[PDB]
Copies of this chain bind each other. A is one copy, B any other.
Amino acid sequence: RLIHVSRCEMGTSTHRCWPRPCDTSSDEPISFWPPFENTPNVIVSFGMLDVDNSNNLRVNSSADDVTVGGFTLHYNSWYTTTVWNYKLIWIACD
């Protein structure tokens, strides 16, 4: 019969830059071995966050350039915001 099933892969990228500050941005090459049949959907979020109250909390995360073979794990803060340590989590299913 015809049915719906999803293949999923997931992981966590961790960043501990303290005492140093974590970079404005960061991009990681995440690959799916083996590739998917079609380009899956991916969502990213935070599992651990270390933000200084001396400035507004501005943390953005995302999956950019999603290829059936992998995707770019993207993170960035902006303006005067300062991030000390942070863990990203992502899950891509199809």
Chain A residues close to B by CB (< 8 Å): 1-12, 34, 36-38, 41, 43-62, 84-85, 87, 89-91, 93-94
Enumerate chain B residues within 8 angstroms of A51, measured Cβ to Cβ: 56-58
Known interface pairs A4-B7, A12-B62; 19 further A-B residue pairs with C-beta atoms within 8 A, sorted by A's residue number: A2-B2, A3-B4, A3-B7, A6-B6, A8-B93, A11-B41, A43-B89, A44-B47, A44-B89, A46-B49, A47-B60, A51-B57, A53-B53, A53-B56, A53-B57, A56-B84, A57-B57, A58-B85, A91-B91
How many copies are assembled? 6
Q: In whole angstroms, what is the CA distance A13 to B76 when docked?
A: 18
Judge whether B4 and A4 touch: CB under 8 Å.
no
Looking at chain A's contact residues, is the secondary structure mostly helix, strand, loop, or mixed? strand
